[PDB]
Amino acid sequence: LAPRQVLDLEDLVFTQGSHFMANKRCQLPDGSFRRQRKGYEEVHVPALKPKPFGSEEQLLPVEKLPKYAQAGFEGFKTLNRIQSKLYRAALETDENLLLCAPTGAGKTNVALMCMLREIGKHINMDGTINVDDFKIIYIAPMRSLVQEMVGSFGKRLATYGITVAELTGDHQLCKEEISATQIIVCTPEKWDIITRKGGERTYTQLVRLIILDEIHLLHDDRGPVLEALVARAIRNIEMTQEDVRLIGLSATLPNYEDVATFLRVDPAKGLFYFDNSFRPVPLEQTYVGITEKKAIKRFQIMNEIVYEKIMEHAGKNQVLVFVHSRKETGKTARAIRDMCLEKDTLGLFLREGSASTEVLRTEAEQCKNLELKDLLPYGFAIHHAGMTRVDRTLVEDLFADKHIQVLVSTATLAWGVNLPAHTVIIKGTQVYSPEKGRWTELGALDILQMLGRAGRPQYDTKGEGILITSHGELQYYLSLLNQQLPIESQMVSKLPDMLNAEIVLGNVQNAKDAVNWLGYAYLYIRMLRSPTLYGISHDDLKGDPLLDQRRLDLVHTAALMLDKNNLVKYDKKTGNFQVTELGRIASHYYITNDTVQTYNQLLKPTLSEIELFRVFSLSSEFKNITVREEEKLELQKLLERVPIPVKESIEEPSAKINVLLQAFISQLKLEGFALMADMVYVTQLAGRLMRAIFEIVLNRGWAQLTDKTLNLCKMIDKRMWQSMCPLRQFRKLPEEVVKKIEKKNFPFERLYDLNHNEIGELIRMPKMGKTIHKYVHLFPKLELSVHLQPITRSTLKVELTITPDFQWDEKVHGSSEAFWILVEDVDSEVILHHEYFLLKAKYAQDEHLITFFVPVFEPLPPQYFIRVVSDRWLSCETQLPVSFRHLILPEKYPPPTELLDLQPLPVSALRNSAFESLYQDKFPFFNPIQTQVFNTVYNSDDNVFVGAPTGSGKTICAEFAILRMLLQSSEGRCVYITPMEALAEQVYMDWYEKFQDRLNKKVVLLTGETSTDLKLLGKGNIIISTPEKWDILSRRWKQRKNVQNINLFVVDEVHLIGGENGPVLEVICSRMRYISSQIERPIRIVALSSSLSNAKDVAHWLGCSATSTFNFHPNVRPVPLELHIQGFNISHTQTRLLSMAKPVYHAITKHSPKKPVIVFVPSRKQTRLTAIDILTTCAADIQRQRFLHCTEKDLIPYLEKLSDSTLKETLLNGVGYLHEGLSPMERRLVEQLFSSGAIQVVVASRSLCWGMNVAAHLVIIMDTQYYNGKIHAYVDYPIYDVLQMVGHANRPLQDDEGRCVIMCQGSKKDFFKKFLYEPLPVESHLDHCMHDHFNAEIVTKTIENKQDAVDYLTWTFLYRRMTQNPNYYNLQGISHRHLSDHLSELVEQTLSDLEQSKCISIEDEMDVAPLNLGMIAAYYYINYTTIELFSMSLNAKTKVRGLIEIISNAAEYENIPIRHHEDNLLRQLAQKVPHKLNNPKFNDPHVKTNLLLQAHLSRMQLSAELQSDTEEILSKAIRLIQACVDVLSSNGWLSPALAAMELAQMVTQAMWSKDSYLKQLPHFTSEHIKRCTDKGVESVFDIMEMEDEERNALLQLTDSQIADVARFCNRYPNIELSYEVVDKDSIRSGGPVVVLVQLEREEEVTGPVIAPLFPQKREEGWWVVIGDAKSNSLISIKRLTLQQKAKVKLDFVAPATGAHNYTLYFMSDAYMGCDQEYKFSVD
Ligand SMILES: Nc1ncnc2c1ncn2[C@@H]1O[C@H](COP(=O)(O)OP(=O)(O)OP(=O)(O)O)[C@@H](O)[C@H]1O
Ligand SMILES: Nc1ncnc2c1ncn2[C@@H]1O[C@H](COP(=O)(O)OP(=O)(O)O)[C@@H](O)[C@H]1O
Ligand SMILES: Nc1ccc(S(N)(=O)=O)cc1
Ligand SMILES: [Mg+2]
Questions:
Q1: Is the CB of 101 under 6 A from ligand 2?
Q2: Phi and psi (nearest 5°) for 608?
Q3: 1631, 1602, 1722: which is closest to 1668 by C-alpha?
Q4: CATH number at residue 1547
Q5: Which residue has the least CA distance to atom 30 on ligand 1?
Q6: Which stretches does the entry tag as region Interaction with C9orf78 and WBP4?
Q7: 528 shares its domain with 618
Q8: Could you tell me where the DSSP H helices lie in 205-316?
């Protein structure tokens, strides 16, 4: 890299700040005349005549202006002279503009027209405007001007339904008032703070137009912030490639074109410059400089000059005087009034208009305080911001209405309000500047503004500007006000802070990045056009025209500064930057680097509040504050009144600052001017600086100093010491009241126990007694509850339940309340864990559960402490000791099985050549894991456990066991179970083409349906299944032989046993252990797993011996892993995500710049977005297509088969993505391209980490939480899901290593740092899912009594772990006795619950038996509570409406997710469905399924994920409906039962109860029905009996339409029924009555049931039913499948005597309207 040079930075800089002039000479216009007065020199320049109207230079009227821009212009008939040249520029082009004009010329309306244009392209046809589509930024230099603008602009655009809102000050992470607004108005340094925050593209993404008002501020010491701002923005336009319009508004000053360059303005098309001949009113300006320095006489001289100047106006004229003190307005107004009453008493009577009128108006307003009463009767008045109230806005009135004759006012009036005067006289021009620590000349920006108020636009002809100042070196002002003071760049002054900001953002990563950034600065353009002025020689410039040396030297110098102060780690060699937490905080809280060093140096855990106050005063933003003599006395008084001792700071500036702050909190009235100005300064800085110290110390875990610092933050905010009364924080509560309660030695906590009457009776003030009670209960108060379960001997899982215990009030609490959860050691010295909890208003009084892990150490202490502290409220916290007194730590886990460094095992150890073949073509030798394992699995016929990290090759370890089975047995059968369906389908693909193609042995994959699955188990050598599918088969293992005689049983990913749905896995694996040892032909168990801590427990459970148990440590992983965990201390997920964007790219380029990359993101929407970001970042880096490793031409043939539109675009750029909205085809395509090498990067959603057969070199996990709409919260990725993600970063054949970067919220970092490197512990949750499996065992009669239930548990993993980690399973005791006790108390509850729910019967306490409800739940695999609710909610008159409600309330649909902002989506659907729901809470999955079910019936296409959810719903719908039939028929109800069967078919075909049966046929629309309704065809029976020529002539056909419908009626069941009553003649009461039903189809043709709008491929089902229609009674029932010919018998019992009238029913569960009816009689 290039050599660098350390720079004398202080030399290169412009020391004079805004006052600096590289102006040299100064030419005056034609009026030159100088009128000396010995004591002071006078200089005049005359008003300018107005330039001539050019050829076709007319003034455009609003009439001609576009009809949509008319609004916001009532109050205007025509356009200004300036505004005419710019109408095309502003409203007809999107070109960047730079406008220069006299202040007052009307540049603002030009900015307004530009706004209108951006609004112009959001007109939305009928709907008036697209308010939520865009945003405009208006950057103004003064807070007073901003509020002025929000006012004016707010009126204009109110007719557009558009909102413009203020946003400047101390707004840290602003509220949703910025998300609602469309025009943001603010100051530079505000906007800078916002766009530094890392999460910024949420405020700025929508921003289409930003406006820089008074951009000459560039010249000021605030100048850099503008440069920083614009450089930052411009660079972003390049990155996102989203065009943003820049508009500059400046005053007529030199260098304007350099500024236009800076703004990327086209000199030909966007530069508009208007010299001072374009003023609103022509200006007669007068400048006077006091020659002599007699300072007392100075005021006397100065006040004499104002005197005579005012006199030359009197009766008809109006004067404005500007001075520079809140109190100087009063002095001056009275000083002149007395002056002109003792110096020849020149008439104030000469002032009051007429001879004595309007004097009564000025007297009728005289009843107002603040020395205004004294001036108003006369001709004088005053205006200042400082504490002036409504009077301020009334002096404004009378001046504007021309009653007030002489107004002297502070500068803020020039910005705050548009009231101009005929003549303006600026007095003195000196200002006390706190940060400079002295008196200096005021800003060039301020002078211009106020002196631009000379002459009222509609009532004046000439304006008179008088400028009184020092003669000494202030011809500078002539330069300013006559187009001659040049605009320079002040960047060097603020370089290292400005650099640091970008570094923290990720915008610059190295000196090179930096040096490029500098090129965006106005600094760069000036150094070019004026190199000598900036210390560059003419010779350097010609040799280095792009200033590559200087910009690197500049950067290098500032880099060393940030390094010295530890804001940034920088090495001179590579030139790379690393960001530190110190520099991160620095940038975020806007504090200079030198301060951060001081804090880093002085802070320490044991800091006292005394030393704390000391430290704050060493802040470098105070480095200029001195202690003046004229204020030493008053400081001494303050020091004696303030509470915190100030050591030996004595009369140093440190002491001054320290007590100034204390005085502020004590609310001490101050007296000394300047001393007040100083106080204001350190107080506004005090929030940030403290909050910064808080974060520094929070992060280091310093418990005590964290508490001190947060409290100090709150004292400054709430202006009260910590000892005072919490009630003071209520600002609407009489301050004498609070003083009364304070002086009582009374503890605040005791106020909660008193009522309004007792309160007053103790304050001795019975009036306020009731309103205090109101406030006490408004005060934030939380209850904390804790639950503990130890994980290892080093970490415990803590479940904190916070519960709000107060009344909410949006005018007191706002929309939320922030807290900090702090968990600390016994000594309360260390913060062990911490996180930020946010109580949103909507969910106040709602339960909040917070989970997290904490470290524990060898000899445990009694307790830890959880403290929950308000972020804003003083004396507002809640503490909770977490006792360890009864804590039993789990047993020490055994070491990992050692990795023997055996020499690698070649494929030749496998003998069989048909075997070796499917391996030899792949890899040369076996990894150290497979070699070590081999011997035991391929040679032995016994049980074995393998525990290695994912990516280690355990799959083929399992395959070893399978080869042996095929070797040892001809048609042997092995069962293989993976916990995930997407994994099941992955192995089946691998194994089918491995075992049925290569080895010619049938390989099968189980499905939902029982009958067809039974068949597959039969013909299969290799069986593949998820645990749930295998459970419903093996549940009846007695009745099924094929389950019993299986040779081999492989369990993969057995660590998932500790996850959700872990129970079912554990139950089946135990069922195999039970069976195997119960038939004496031992089944071989082979279990594969991630590295376990407690593998001994698993092996002993599954029959493995220690030796044949292979649990390796994660470091054993064949491809070594490089893990990096990157925390983000950002709580708001959307923000966290957005600020992870740049770090994702930067990670690719660092860790895997060439090799492939997978990025996981939490959602489908994120998947598309992150991809697009990577592209745009890439193209901005000038790379464009560095992730495409083929040519675009090569891809076209594949991308032709894509319809997504956008991954077509992204893949073309080398980046793909994956979610579940993509077609299975679209997925396969993308994966293929990735494995091939064509694309380097795919972004996949978290859900697809299980369904991906793709490996990268680098895996990036972007955030680790997903939103769960049910509990309105974000929840963590299961560790299982993350272990998997990381496994994707291994490619054994191509990389020397795998790399993983996890990006997570900071509160999560420490958790990942343990459970990724170390082995994993696992527990059972069988006990929390114990009912359904017991209920099934009692049905199968494996559990015949209570003892058998205890015996059954002895085969489970649960049984092993209860002894090893008792507190996890809440075994309050320890071992041996408590164990038998707890087992028996567990079986007791479950049987009780099952008995109470009608599922089982308990007889003699010991014995159990299945009941009806229990039989139906075991059969259909339905949770027992579902059928409890089914039998509880189904009556005699339930119809298909109530049936849907009941079925959707199934416990099965509980797990249906509610995603972010679907509550708005579901709310819409509800007001669009046939059957309305009452009180339907839209975070309830049941409410969701209910609507999603109607939408499916109503053939509605909707959101992608909703159709995707509908699929998971329908997938369980059938078994649920069938269950309902069973219950209604078990209860003898006729009506509901039949309607329930209708539901079964109408679900399958997706149609309603009275929808035309014509909808069963493909391609038919709702209009095709009425062209058959009128025609005479309203049935499917009709279209089958009419000839073919007449059939296709009916409606519109195609060749492929005829093909689909033909095959439809080749499977539409043809029905005919014959029946006889056996012994029809001889039948009596109480005797059996047999009805023999004959069934046969004539189709002969059969096949898969066609129901296009149904995700499952289901089979035909039929119910034959007998009932009494008259009395609503179901008499007999039988379900079957046709098989072409069938004989169904079903008998019942006869009534007392006579003959009855019955009905015979024949219903389908699949097709609509095949149903037959028959009336018959017996006896
Ligand atoms: N001896 C070997 N040499 C090189 N590559 C191998 C070897 N054995 C397996 N592989 C490959 O390594 C990849 C990872 O192996 P595998 O899928 O078995 O991981 P695992 O450790 O079993 O965990 P999981 O199966 O849960 O991902 C597979 O794609 C496989 O093809
Ligand atoms: N077409 C117009 N008709 C009447 N008044 C105008 C017109 N254009 C601008 N003005 C007035 O000129 C005054 C000063 O102009 P402003 O828009 O504040 O820009 P600037 O002061 O930055 O030049 C404003 O009070 C505004 O009302
Ligand atoms: N300021 C801050 C925000 C969030 C977090 S954390 N640890 O909850 O993510 C810490 C500090
Ligand atoms: Mg595996």
A1: yes
A2: -90, 160
A3: 1722
A4: 1.10.3380.10
A5: 953
A6: 1-1723
A7: no
A8: 223-240, 256-262, 295-311
Q: Is 1436 annotated as a binding residue?
A: no
What is d(CA 1432, CA 1428) in angstroms, rounded to the nearest whole number?
Answer: 6
Check which CATH number belongs to the domain holding 494 and give it: 1.10.10.10
- 197 shares a domain with 79: yes
Q: In one letter, which amino acid is 843?
A: Y
Secondary-structure breakdown of the chain: helix, strand, coil percentages, each rounded to the nearest 5: 40, 15, 40
**Residue 1461 CB-density burial (10 A; 0-12 exposed, 13-18 middle, 19+ buried):** exposed
- SS3 (DSSP) at 1339: helix
Round to whole Å and give the CA distance between 586 and 580. Answer: 10
What is the spatial distance between Cα 378 and Cα 226, in angstroms, rounded to a whole number?
45
Strand duo 795-804 + 782-790: pairing: antiparallel
Q: Are residues 400 and 420 in the same domain?
A: yes
Are 378 and 471 in a shared domain?
yes
Among residues 737, 759, 778, the one where a domain terminates is 778
Does residue 25 fall inside a structural domain?
A: no
Closest residue by CA, ligand 1 atom 22: 954
Element (H, E) at 1600: helix 1599-1608
Kindly list the strands in the beta sheet with 1617-1622, ordered across the sheet, starting from the edge strand earlier in the chain: 1617-1622, 1632-1640, 1685-1693
The backbone torsions φ and ψ at residue 1585, rounded to the nearest 5 degrees and listed phi first, read -105, -10
Q: Whose CA is nearest to atom 2 of ligand 3?
A: 1129
Q: CA nearest 1186: which of 1148, 1211, 1214, 1161?
A: 1214
Which residue is it, tokens 């699955």?
1013
Q: Which amino acid is at 22?
A: A
Nearest ligand, measured from the Cα of 102 = 2
Can you name the residues that pair with 1003 across neighbouring β-strands?
Answer: 1022
Amino acid letter at 547?
A: L
Task: Report yes or no: 1253 and 1241 within 8 Å, Cβ to Cβ.
Answer: no
CA-CA distance, 777 to 775, in Å (whole number)? 5
Claim to verify: residue 865 and residue 942 sit in the same structural domain: no
For residue 1018, the cross-strand partners are none
Name the DSSP letter for residue 894.
Answer: P
Pocket test for ligand 2, best of 58, 65, 108, 156 (most atoms within 8 A of CB): 108
1693: domain CATH number is: 2.60.40.150
Any idea which ligand is nearest the CA of 197?
3
In a domain, 605, yes or no: yes
Cβ-in-10-Å burial (0-12, 13-18, 19+) of 1028 comes to: middle
Q: Is 948 annotated as a binding residue?
A: yes
Looking at the DSSP bridge assignments, the partners of residue 438 are 433
- 1564 residue type, one letter: F
How many angstroms separate the CA atoms of 802 and 782, rounded?
Answer: 7
In terms of residue numbers, what domain contains 783? 779-887
Q: Is 107 in the pocket of ligand 2 (CB under 6 A)?
A: yes
How does DSSP assign 1008-1032, residue by residue?
S-HHHHHHHHHH-SEEEE-HHHHHH
User: Cβ < 6 Å from ligand 3: which residues?
Assistant: 695, 834-836, 1129, 1131, 1305-1307
Torsion of CA 603, 608, 613, 619, to 10 degrees: -10
Q: How far apart are CA 36 and CA 43, in angstroms?
A: 8
Expressed in Å, this structure's resolution amounts to: 2.9
- Residue 872: CB atoms within 10 A of its CB come to 17
Pick the residue whose CA is nearest to atom 11 on ligand 2.
106
Domains of the chain: total = 12
Both tokens assigned to 1297: 């290593």
Tokens representing 344 are 């020849």
Contact 487, 256 (CB under 8 A): yes
Nearest ligand 1 atom, CA 930:
1
CATH number of the domain that residue 749 is part of = 1.10.150.20
Region of 492 (left: φ > 0; alpha: ψ -120 to 50; beta: rest) is alpha
Instruction: Return the amino acid letter for 1676.
Output: S
Q: Which ligand is nearest to the CA of 950?
A: 1
Q: Give 717's contacts (C-beta < 8 A, 6+ positions apart).
A: 687, 872
**321 three-state secondary structure:** strand
